[PDB]
Amino acid sequence: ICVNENGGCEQYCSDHTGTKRSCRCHEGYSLLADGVSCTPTVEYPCGKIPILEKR
Amino acid sequence: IVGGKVCPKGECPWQVLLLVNGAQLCGGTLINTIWVVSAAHCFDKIKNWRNLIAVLGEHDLSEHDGDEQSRRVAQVIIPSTYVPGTTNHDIALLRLHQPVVLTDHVVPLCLPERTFSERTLAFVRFSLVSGWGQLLDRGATALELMVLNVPRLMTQDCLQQSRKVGDSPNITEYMFCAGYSDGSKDSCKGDSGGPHATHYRGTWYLTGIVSWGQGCATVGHFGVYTRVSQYIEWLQKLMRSEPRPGVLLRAPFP
Ligand SMILES: COc1cc([C@@H]2Nc3ccc(C(=N)N)cc3[C@H]3c4ccccc4C[C@H]32)c(-c2ccc(C(=O)O)cc2)cc1O
Numbered sequence: 001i002c003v004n005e006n007g008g009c010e011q012y013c014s015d016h017t018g019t020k021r022s023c024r025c026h027e028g029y030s031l032l033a034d035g036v037s038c039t040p041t042v043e044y045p046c047g048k049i050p051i052l053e054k055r
Numbered sequence: 056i057v058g059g060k061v062c063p064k065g066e067c068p069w070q071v072l073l074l075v076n077g078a079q080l081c082g083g084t085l086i087n088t089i090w091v092v093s094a095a096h097c098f099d100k101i102k103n104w105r106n107l108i109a110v111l112g113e114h115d116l117s118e119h120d121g122d123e124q125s126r127r128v129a130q131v132i133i134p135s136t137y138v139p140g141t142t143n144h145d146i147a148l149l150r151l152h153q154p155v156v157l158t159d160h161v162v163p164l165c166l167p168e169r170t171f172s173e174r175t176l177a178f179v180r181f182s183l184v185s186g187w188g189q190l191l192d193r194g195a196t197a198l199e200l201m202v203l204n205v206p207r208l209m210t211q212d213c214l215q216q217s218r219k220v221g222d223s224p225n226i227t228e229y230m231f232c233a234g235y236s237d238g239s240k241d242s243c244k245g246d247s248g249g250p251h252a253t254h255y256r257g258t259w260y261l262t263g264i265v266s267w268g269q270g271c272a273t274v275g276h277f278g279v280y281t282r283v284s285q286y287i288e289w290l291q292k293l294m295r296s297e298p299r300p301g302v303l304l305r306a307p308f309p
Pocket residue numbers: 096099140141142145241242243244245246247265266267268269270271272277278279
């Protein structure tokens with residue numbers, strides 16, 4: 001599943017036996033209940049640009 | 056950087072400036088509060104390792120505005136497979152003596168997982184490269200941080216689109232080409248070590264390191280970048296290791 005469009009994951013994707021797929025996030029992020037989205041848990045998460053985010 | 060623009064202050068917050076004895080040496084990329092990724096070749100000629108400094112939050116080299124944070128480089132870790140003076144395995148992992156403080160102007164770029172980088176990031180066409188390198192081939196270096204959007208090529212395609220020069224280094228699986236062959240846009244030697252950064256669904260990731268090329272923005276040629284995805288496991292293991300005496304460390308690769 002992960003090979004096709006990143007398994008639908010916003011960040012990281014893990015394949016499991018059968019049609020099972022688990023999305024994960026970089027440190028400083030947590031996965032939302034949709035099972036695909038990652039949201040920051042810290043003030044300065046990696047890969048985000050504060051002056052643009054704050055606009 | 057040739058043919059790009061000024062990176063608006065704060066929009067390249069992971070960019071690192073490396074100095075030796077106060078003089079600019081290379082770029083680098085912050086990937087968390089204590090680790091920086093740069094190019095191995097940046098360190099071929101260093102003799103006094105105690106005068107190596109990383110600056111975060113830098114933008115304009117002519118002024119001090121208070122957002123700059125300087126740290127001594129405590130360790131430079133290079134793959135055992137890198138041979139000084141050559142092109143392959145052009146990557147270094149730098150441990151700062153003290154963490155930088157994350158701020159609006161100092162933020163790490165995400166080091167991606169290998170599978171995500173190979174399967175997804177590698178197919179994002181355009182990515183940003185940045186640095187205070189030469190604005191023109193054989194020209195002066197930039198006072199303000201510059202950034203350029205470049206398209207990535209498959210290596211087969213690179214070799215087919217490139218002019219043949221002979222003696223030219225092979226493009227290995229640990230490299231990739233990006234840029235333009237019309238002589239207009241490229242990174243340059245002074246940008247060495249700096250980020251090739253790729254955006255995916257709202258977030259930026261480290262995919263390349265400015266490594267080498269034929270001159271700068273040379274007709275018939277593309278910039279060549281270290282393929283960071285080959286080194287994710289190597290980097291992660293090292294970042295979990297305890298510091299060792301002596302600045303330079305050669306670490307086994309794989
Ligand atoms: C891959 O290893 C290496 C790569 C480079 C250096 N790095 C880079 C980096 C990027 C590009 C690019 N077009 N995207 C080109 C070069 C290459 C380039 C452009 C113009 C002149 C000479 C060179 C050699 C080379 C150097 C190097 C860097 C700076 C200077 C200088 O300041 O005079 C001289 C040589 C040393 C290495 O060992």
